[PDB]
From Swiss-Prot, chain A:
Subunit structure of this chain's protein: Component of the 19S proteasome regulatory particle complex. The 26S proteasome consists of a 20S core particle (CP) and two 19S regulatory subunits (RP). The regulatory particle is made of a lid composed of 9 subunits, a base containing 6 ATPases including PSMC2 and few additional components. Interacts with NDC80/HEC; this interaction is detected only during M phase. Interacts and SQSTM1. Interacts with PAAF1. Directly interacts with TRIM5.
Record function comment: Component of the 26S proteasome, a multiprotein complex involved in the ATP-dependent degradation of ubiquitinated proteins. This complex plays a key role in the maintenance of protein homeostasis by removing misfolded or damaged proteins, which could impair cellular functions, and by removing proteins whose functions are no longer required. Therefore, the proteasome participates in numerous cellular processes, including cell cycle progression, apoptosis, or DNA damage repair.
Location relative to the cell: Cytoplasm
Source species of the chain: Homo sapiens (Human)
Signal peptide location: none
Entry's family note: Belongs to the AAA ATPase family.
Protein name per the record: 26S proteasome regulatory subunit 7
Post-translational modification: Monoubiquitinated by RNF181.
Expression induction or repression: Expression is not cell cycle-dependent and occurs throughout the cell cycle.
Included stretch of the parent chain: 67 to 109 of 433
Curated annotation (Swiss-Prot), chain B:
Function description: Component of the 26S proteasome, a multiprotein complex involved in the ATP-dependent degradation of ubiquitinated proteins. This complex plays a key role in the maintenance of protein homeostasis by removing misfolded or damaged proteins, which could impair cellular functions, and by removing proteins whose functions are no longer required. Therefore, the proteasome participates in numerous cellular processes, including cell cycle progression, apoptosis, or DNA damage repair.
Gene this protein is translated from: PSMC1
Source species of the chain: Homo sapiens (Human)
Protein name: 26S proteasome regulatory subunit 4
Family as reported in the entry's similarity comment: Belongs to the AAA ATPase family.
Cellular component GO terms, alphabetical: cytosol; membrane; nucleoplasm; nucleus; proteasome accessory complex; proteasome complex; proteasome regulatory particle, base subcomplex
Binding, ATP: 133-140
Quaternary state and interactors: Component of the 19S proteasome regulatory particle complex. The 26S proteasome consists of a 20S core particle (CP) and two 19S regulatory subunits (RP). The regulatory particle is made of a lid composed of 9 subunits, a base containing 6 ATPases including PSMC1 and few additional components. Interacts with SCA7. Interacts with NGLY1. Interacts with PAAF1.
Organismal lineage: Eukaryota, Metazoa, Chordata, Craniata, Vertebrata
Location in or out of the cell: Cytoplasm; Nucleus; Membrane
Keyword match Membrane: yes
Swiss-Prot record, chain C:
Subunit annotation: Component of the 19S proteasome regulatory particle complex. The 26S proteasome consists of a 20S core particle (CP) and two 19S regulatory subunits (RP). The regulatory particle is made of a lid composed of 9 subunits, a base containing 6 ATPases including PSMC5 and few additional components. Component of a complex with USP49 and RUVBL1. Interacts with PRPF19. Interacts with TRIM5. Interacts with NDC80. Interacts with PAAF1. Interacts, in vitro, with the thyroid hormone receptor (in a thyroid hormone T3-dependent manner) and with retinoid X receptor (RXR). Interacts with ERCC6.
Subcellular location: Cytoplasm; Nucleus
Highest taxon above the source species: Eukaryota
Protein name: 26S proteasome regulatory subunit 8
Gene: PSMC5
Native organism: Homo sapiens (Human)
Function: Component of the 26S proteasome, a multiprotein complex involved in the ATP-dependent degradation of ubiquitinated proteins. This complex plays a key role in the maintenance of protein homeostasis by removing misfolded or damaged proteins, which could impair cellular functions, and by removing proteins whose functions are no longer required. Therefore, the proteasome participates in numerous cellular processes, including cell cycle progression, apoptosis, or DNA damage repair.
Stretch of the intact protein here: 59 to 108 of 406
Family stated for the protein in its record: Belongs to the AAA ATPase family.
Amino acid sequence: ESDTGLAPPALWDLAADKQTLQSEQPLQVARCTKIINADSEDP
Amino acid sequence: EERSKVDDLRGTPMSVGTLEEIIDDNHAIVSTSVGSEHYVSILSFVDKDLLEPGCSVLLNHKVHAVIGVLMDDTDPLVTVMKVEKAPQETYADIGGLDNQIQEIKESVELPLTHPEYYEEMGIKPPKGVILYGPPGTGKTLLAKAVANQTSATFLRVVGSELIQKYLGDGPKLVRELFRVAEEHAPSIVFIDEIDAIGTKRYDSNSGGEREIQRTMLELLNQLDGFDSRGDVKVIMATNRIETLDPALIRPGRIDRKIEFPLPDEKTKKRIFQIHTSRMTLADDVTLDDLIMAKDDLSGADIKAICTEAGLMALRERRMKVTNEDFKKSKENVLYKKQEGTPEGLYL
Amino acid sequence: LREELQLLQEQGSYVGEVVRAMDKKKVLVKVHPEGKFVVDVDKNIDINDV
């Protein structure tokens, strides 16, 4: 069956109210990459 | 009510993601199916206990946040290779190789059943046992003969259900196998044909060999992590040995190098009897002339005779097999490798 | 001709090969250029479509 992390409701009931909503619009999505080099006095 | 709100809080076209690593600060790094890696946040109803590096989760399209953990039949690739049923005949199937039986009995059954010889003196049991020699010299038949007489679970690895292309599935199933070896009885790790993965220790620059050398190094690491193994026995078998990994032949890891030399016409007569046992052997046939004439044939050849003897009976619409069928199968099947012998020169 | 023209002004549909999936009105569709997707069924079709 599609479980999808059921978590029987005692540990996330307060967390699912609006803390999810503050993780949606303020918290953006980033990506991890690699740095080749840099420059002096100007990044 | 509350279950329907959170099941509708996330987006409906949920995308199948892939975990890479976990940071314990309400976010983590994941990986898409295209390999693009996204530094996303994780929710709090996600049941943060089963989260493992290598599992799959559910992601969003907008922010790609970790919606929920995804099952994967929990491991389809360690439960198939585990033997559940009984193997072949225990000790009477084989013959003539009783020199090596005391080796494998005292190295496996004696550390398990009677671990007091090792405690009266203080001599540790061996871990690695290597089976090499001629190709098809009866290494498959011997490994099933030992694994029948047992009191513990047994593991059977093909050797080709280890290398994938997912960049992490190589070293993953090493821990998956040894956990099954740990959670169950102190089983016998039988990984057959390790020569395709372990040879000559070369490093190249492409992305083709890097999935081999790490998995080779991680298995050598996970075998000898030296923390807690619980007396895991490992049997490794290939045909050849000269193009293999030298640092597994060195002591400290494997101190048993069992060879299987070539048999004689003495061991054949049982193999002729065993292969001509589950058939309609008519009482007008002779097998002893077929043993006396041909001087080089293995268990695969006799089985190839028995099938050809079975085919010739079905051609002329019969049930039993006549003696001329065994003669014509001996003169048709066995004429494929008879080449090269110094006759009439030696005494 | 208007019926053929009104459905013409409409975006294309994907394809997904499904061998098996789960129940509870969510199926498992794997597209060709990308990976798998847990999606939702329609109301014009059934669920027993595995």
